[PDB]
């Protein structure tokens, strides 16, 4: 089925919440920039990446709902847009992973994180992560093709073109499966087990006890919503795997899975900046 009104009606408040959260993060980052910790710089980079993916998804989503074919966008345009979207999503998830691991090593070794004033190293790390995200999004974007309008009439195409994955289905399927597994099994397990060890450490450590209990429950709910929000984006690609079965009902349920994955990813990108900067007002 095709529905444009509910998609926009549910994406407008999500986008509003996302831009409001990004504005709040930018405001609290501008305040006391000298006292800002490298973790605050990581959070600012994550917020900028969230804004990038939001303003790359919402306009493209409403344009696709209005017309499936791109409007005033050629092949290089689709290539650049897909590359930017993929690298921004990769940078977001990888920066979340690095934030998790740095929080883990800081709560496990506070003296180690306190010494040496590890500030420029954080900048170099985020730069190398952005570079790795670009280098990983380049091959997945290079494998993309426009078949044709493909109508056996006339002399020219009637302005119909899609920016799909026209490359052989086996290679693209293997690439998507490898990407989905390497971006779900490894980093989700990392952020789960590291935050679980943090939970055990804070429970062994525990005015102070209510704060520790609140931190523990917020940790639990954060990992829960992170799993529940990053599960659809990969169950979609797994549904792409090994089963095509071109029909009407399976196509309909696949489109429903796609739109629910999209709205879940949108709400996740909107809630991440406001849920990561809840403890610290600055």
């Amino acid at each position: 089925s095709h529905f444009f009104l509910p998609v926009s009606v549910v994406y407008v408040p999500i986008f509003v919440v996302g831009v409001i959260g990004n504005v709040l993060v930018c405001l609290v980052i501008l305040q006391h920039q000298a006292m800002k910790t490298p973790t605050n710089y990581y959070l600012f980079s994550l917020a900028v990446s969230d804004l990038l993916v939001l303003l790359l998804g919402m306009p493209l989503e409403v344009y696709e709902m209005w017309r499936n074919y791109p409007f005033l966008f050629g092949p290089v345009g689709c290539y650049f847009k897909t590359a930017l979207f993929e690298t921004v999503c990769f940078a977001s998830i990888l920066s979340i992973t690095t934030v998790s691991v740095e929080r883990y090593v800081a709560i496990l070794h506070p003296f180690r994180a306190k010494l040496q004033s590890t500030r420029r190293r954080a900048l170099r790390i985020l730069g190398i992560v952005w570079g790795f995200s670009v280098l990983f999004s380049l091959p997945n974007t290079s494998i993309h093709g426009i078949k044709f309008h493909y109508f056996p009439n006339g002399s020219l195409v009637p302005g119909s073109a899609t920016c799909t994955v026209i490359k052989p289905m086996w290679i693209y399927n293997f690439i998507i499966q490898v990407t989905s597994f390497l971006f779900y099994l490894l980093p989700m397990t990392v952020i789960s087990v590291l935050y679980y060890l943090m939970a055990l450490r804070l429970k062994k450590d525990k005015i102070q006890r209510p704060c520790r209990k609140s931190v523990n429950k917020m940790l639990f709910v954060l990992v829960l919503v992170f799993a529940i929000c990053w599960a659809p984006f990969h169950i979609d690609r797994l549904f792409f795997s090994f089963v095509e079965e071109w029909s009407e009902s399976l196509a309909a349920v696949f489109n429903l899975v796609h739109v629910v994955s999209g709205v879940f990813f949108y709400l996740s990108s909107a809630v991440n900046p406001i849920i990561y900067n809840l403890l610290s007002r600055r």
């Binding site: 696709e64 017309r67 979207f85 997945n140 119909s160 899609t162 994955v165 796609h258």
Partner: peptide, 25 residues
Amino acid sequence: FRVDEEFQSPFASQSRGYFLFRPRN
């Protein structure tokens, strides 16, 4: 309207019945 643009069920436009929304990738 067979002389129209598409006039067939397989078409990139909306309301086709196949996968309408492309994956986010």
